[PDB]
Structure formats: C-alpha cells, structure tokens
From Swiss-Prot:
Disruption phenotype: Mating heterozygous mice gives rise to Ptprs deficient mice at the expected Mendelian rate, but the pups are somewhat lighter than their littermates at birth and display strongly impaired weight gain. After about three weeks, mutant mice weigh only 50 to 55% of normal littermates, possibly due to reduced Igf1 levels in blood serum. Pups born after crossing Ptprs deficient mice display about 41% lethality during the first day after birth. Adult mutants have a reduced overall brain size, with a dramatic decrease in the size of the olfactory bulb. It comes from Mus musculus (Mouse). The gene is Ptprs. Cell surface receptor that binds to glycosaminoglycans, including chondroitin sulfate proteoglycans and heparan sulfate proteoglycans. Binding to chondroitin sulfate and heparan sulfate proteoglycans has opposite effects on PTPRS oligomerization and regulation of neurite outgrowth. Contributes to the inhibition of neurite and axonal outgrowth by chondroitin sulfate proteoglycans, also after nerve transection. Plays a role in stimulating neurite outgrowth in response to the heparan sulfate proteoglycan GPC2. The active site is at 223 (phosphocysteine intermediate), 506 (phosphocysteine intermediate). Detected in brain cortex, cerebellum and thoracic spinal cord (at protein level). Detected in motor cortex and white matter of the spinal cord, but not in spinal cord gray matter. Isoform 1 and isoform 6 are predominantly expressed in the brain (cerebrum and cerebellum) and to a lesser extent in the heart and skeletal muscle. Also found in neuronal-derived cell lines. Detected in the ganglion cell layer of the retina and in glial cells along the optic nerve. Detected in bone marrow and spleen plasmacytoid dendritic cells. A cleavage occurs, separating the extracellular domain from the transmembrane segment. This process called 'ectodomain shedding' is thought to be involved in receptor desensitization, signal transduction and/or membrane localization. Residues 1-568 are cytoplasmic. This is Receptor-type tyrosine-protein phosphatase S. The lineage of its organism: Eukaryota, Metazoa, Chordata, Craniata, Vertebrata. Residues 27-282, 314-565 form the Tyrosine-protein phosphatase domain. The chain holds residues 1326 to 1901 of 1907 of the full protein.
Length: 568
C-alpha cells in the first residue's frame, strides 16, 4: 500500500522501535487507522433462531465470509455458525475464525469441521480463566461422544507445560468415512494482557504447523469470541509464511484484510504490539530443531568452521542467544552478583515478615518444565547471609528437592557457602535442619534432611543432590554421569510423593543450573517427540531467568549429553 508499505526484514527492528517510541504512539495511530473501508451485512447472525448461537451479541459473522453449514431441512437457521473464513497471505480462506462453541452449538462446530474437511483445530484459550468461563468443553473427557450428527472419539492426549495436544476421530451419521482431526490448545496466555515473551507461543505455532497436513481444509481457530487471540495466531502464521517467500512483513495490510472478513480481528493495541514482537524474534531466530537420527549429523556440522567464517557453528549459534523490585538499595547484600538477577514475573515471592520491608526478595526464578509450569526454581548458591532465606524459600514453595551443581570450592575459590549441617542440628531463623542420612554416590552426593518449622512444629523431608563430577574447568567429556544424575533426581521426585518444584542452583544459579533444566527438558522431549531443539530450549529458559547456560562449553555439553543419550 501507499500509506503503509511492506516492512522488509532487516528494517523491522527499527520499525518496531519507531512504533514503540514515546509510549507506543505511532503504533497507537497505526492500529487506530485500521479500516477495510467497506460496509458489510450480518443478517444471518441476527435471525432470531441464530441470536442465541452467538456467545457475544456484539461479535457477529459477516454474511459474505461466513461459514455456511449444510441446512438441516425443516430447521431454520440450521445453516448458521458464528464463524468466518480468514485469508492467509497468498492463502485464500486458509483459516476459519470462530467463537468458542456453546453447549447448544457443539454439534454445529463439529459439523463445520466435517463439512469443511478441516484437519486441525487451534484453541487459543483455557476453558476457564480467572474463574470466568471463556469456552465450554466441546469434546469428551474420554472415548466417544455424539454432538449432532458427529461422533467424536478422543484417541490421545499429550499435555505439555504451555499447551495440550489431543487427537480425535470423527465419524458421521451412517457415513462410512472416518476423519482424523488434531486439536492444539495453547494454555499459557495470561489472564490479562498478552504474553511477556512470544517464544512459548512461537513454539506452539511451529507444533501446529508441522502437524497440520498440507491437503486439508481450513485450519479452525478460536478463542472465546474468536477475534482477539485467534487474530494474533492467524496474522503471526500468515506473516511467517510471507517472509518465507518475500522476506518482508505487512502486519498492517493483513489485519486490515482480516477486518474485512471478520469483525475486530486483533482486538487490542497490546495484541497488535505483541504480533510485531513475535515476528521480530522469529526472523533472527531461525530453524534450530533437528529430528533424532539427524542429531549426530547436525552436531558434526556445528563442530566445524565454515569456509569464510571465523568460529565453529556451535559458537555462532550460542552467540545468537543475545527487575527493579530486586535491585532496591537494600538488596545490595542479598545477591552474589548484581548483574545476574531474577525477573519480576518469575521471581519466587517470600511471605513477608511482619515489620521488615524488603525481605521478600530472594534471588530465585520460577522455571517451567516440559510437562508442567513452575517445575523448577533456579536460584543462586546461598551465601552466609543468604542461607536463612534459602531454607525459608524451600519451605514456602513446597520444594522438597534441592539440586546443587558445584563443589563448595573450585579453583582455589569458594563457589558456595555450606548452608546445611553435617554433625549437629542447625536452627536457621524459624527452622531447624537435621542431618539424617548421607550417601556418597560416584558422580554425586545425596543428603537427607529433616526441616522442622520452629513456629508450627511441622517437619518435612528435603533430599539434596550435589553433583561432584563437574570438571573444575570446562565440561564433562561424557554425559553418562549427568544423564543418570538427572534421572535419579526425577525418579526420587515422583516415588516420594513430592508435588512441588525442584530447586536447582550452582554458583550464580544460571550456568550449570541452565544446563540441568535444559537437559531435563531436552531429554524428555527426545524420548516422546523424538526431536531436539536445545537452542529454543535455552531461549525459553532465558525468558524466565536471565543468562541461563552461561558459556559455549555448557552449550556444547547439552549437545554431547543429547547425542550420548540417543546412543543409549
């Protein structure tokens, strides 16, 4: 367009900075100007038989773009569903944007999927968000359920930390045909505003796109109203497909086109900003995922210096990986480093003492696992005047497993303050720690403790694992000892009935800590999904705590452990 021309990649970051400038003013003016410049009708949405088929009276389906169901003759309005075709870039009716189905429209929705020959459904919402129903569950808990003319059979569930994948079989009334449909529910969108980092969503999108067949009907996408998160998903995807052919981006143009196909597509200014951030991150972070039996080949490639390039592929890839409530003038003793600090939206909150303002801070960040959120806590190795807060932190967060990743002293220097007793009892503020058992294993030491609350008298078992075999300088040549150590901690977690996060630290609590959480994730995804993407794994971790996996040597070791684990 004239007024809003395409944004070429490599001029994108400066475009977003110009949009962000002075309280997102240019973005605000860009977003407020969005107008397809046409008049539409919505007579079908307004038929009195169809009125109650709308979740929101104010979110309707335009006539010219509506999804038309085959009429159930004898029944007026039976051709109506609140849904519209929406274009991709160079992709006519690539998507169907629709509301979250209502109890009364379950059958209509599944009949739409059938008649439109769709194969993928994208659900951009949790069923309930902040005690408010955003969508009703339109699929069986197990086995088969009938909705109108469609039998829906749940075949499988795969439930990860940020999204859940369900597989279904569809069988229609009499019809001998059987259709398969895959259902992707992103569950990590925040209750208010948009995600702080686009990385987890972008991984959700890749998953969706690799598992959607290429000869299927339009991807069905919905949230609650099917305009807001739905719109974000559609534009992100379309623009990713755009840069694949044009190396340019036209968010402005596409949203305008979407608005001509469904009301309010991309509902808020925040969503419009989020779309840009997600696309900026995506252009500088390319494909780094590799299938299992190509990992060695891929590792063999990164281990090499390319003609005309200065350092190994492993080195460049690692180079491409680059709050205030913590940095208060009172916390200038609570941190080992003033340059390695937890983020706000992840930092572990300590229940504050009656009359000590500024003592809720502990250098610890919540970290999501592979299957569940907040599966880990990434913290620094405690200091003398930090010890008390660490034991405090463990109790309040139901963390009954500690993972230490350093020797107490390395290279003629302390790395961590011994925070646990060895030969007596030790009262740390309102807690007392009993050394119960101590096992010396080959690569690590397991220490059992009896933390008893001095206030309410309650006692908990805390098992501490300390890996003793990390070379004083560099990385292990074999991952075997680390693979097993990772194994043992998680084995110990489950069989002891420990429904709480695993606390992990090293010295600063980023370098070997990052390596531990990374491989814990990578090794389980490799077992189930059969693919490896360590780059994106470190990227996500870094969006929950900064500097995770501190060095090139740590980074390469993740690959070493992955390659060895595949061999086993």
């Amino acid at each position: 367009m004239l007024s809003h021309p395409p944004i070429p990649i490599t001029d994108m970051a400066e475009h977003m900075e110009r949009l962000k400038a002075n309280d997102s003013l240019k973005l605000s003016q860009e977003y407020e100007s969005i107008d397809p410049g046409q008049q539409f009708t919505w007579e079908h949405s307004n038929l009195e038989a169809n009125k109650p088929k709308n979740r929101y009276a104010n979110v309707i389906a335009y006539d010219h773009s509506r999804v038309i169901l085959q009429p159930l003759e004898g029944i007026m309005g039976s051709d109506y569903i609140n849904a519209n075709y929406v274009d991709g870039y160079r992709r006519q009716n690539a998507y169907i944007a629709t509301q979250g189905p209502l109890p009364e429209t379950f059958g209509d929705f599944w009949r739409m999927v059938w008649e439109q020959r769709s194969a993928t459904v994208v659900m951009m919402t949790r069923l309930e968000e902040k005690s408010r129903i955003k969508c009703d569950q339109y699929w069986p808990n197990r086995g088969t359920e009938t909705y109108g003319f469609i039998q829906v059979t749940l075949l499988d569930t795969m439930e990860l930390a940020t999204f859940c994948v369900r597989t279904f079989s569809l069988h229609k009334n009499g019809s001998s045909e059987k259709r398969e449909v895959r259902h992707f529910q992103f569950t990590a969108w925040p209750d208010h505003g948009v995600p702080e980092y686009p990385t987890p969503f972008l991984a959700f999108l890749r998953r969706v796109k690799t598992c959607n067949p290429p000869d299927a009907g339009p991807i069905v996408v919905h949230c609650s109203a099917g305009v807001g998160r739905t719109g974000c998903f559609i534009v992100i995807d379309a623009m990713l497909e755009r840069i694949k052919t044009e190396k340019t981006v036209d968010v402005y143009g596409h949203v305008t086109l979407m608005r001509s196909q469904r009301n309010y597509m991309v509902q808020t200014e925040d969503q419009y900003g989020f779309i840009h951030e997600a696309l900026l991150e995506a252009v500088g972070c390319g494909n780094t995922e590799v299938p299992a039996r190509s990992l060695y080949t891929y590792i063999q490639k990164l281990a090499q210096v390319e003609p005309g390039e200065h350092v190994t592929g492993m080195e460049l890839e690692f180079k491409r990986l680059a709050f205030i409530t913590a940095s208060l003038p009172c916390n200038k003793f609570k941190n080992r480093l003033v340059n390695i600090l937890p983020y706000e939206s992840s930092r572990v909150c300590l229940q504050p003492i009656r009359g000590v303002e500024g003592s809720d801070y502990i250098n610890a960040s919540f970290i999501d696992g592979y299957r569940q959120q907040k599966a880990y806590i990434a913290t620094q190795g405690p200091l003398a005047e930090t010890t008390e807060d660490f034991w405090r932190a463990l109790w309040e967060n139901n963390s009954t497993i500690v993972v230490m990743l350093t020797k107490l002293r390395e290279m003629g220097r302390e790395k961590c303050h011994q925070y646990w007793p060895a030969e007596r009892s030790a009262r740390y503020q309102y807690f007392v720690v009993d050394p119960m058992a101590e096992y010396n294993m080959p690569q690590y030491i397991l220490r059992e403790f009896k933390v008893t609350d001095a206030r309410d008298g309650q006692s908990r078992t805390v098992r501490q694992f300390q890996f003793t075999d990390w070379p004083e300088q560099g990385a292990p040549k074999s991952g075997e000892g680390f693979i097993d150590f990772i194994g043992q901690v998680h084995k110990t977690k489950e069989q002891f009935g420990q429904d709480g996060p695993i606390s992990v630290h090293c010295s600063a609590g980023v370098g070997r800590t990052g390596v531990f959480i990374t491989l814990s994730i990578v090794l389980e995804r490799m077992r189930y999904e059969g693919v490896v993407d360590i780059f994106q794994t470190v990227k996500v971790l870094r969006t929950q705590r900064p500097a995770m996996v501190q060095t090139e040597d740590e980074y390469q070791f993740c690959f070493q452990a992955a390659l060895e684990y595949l061999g086993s």
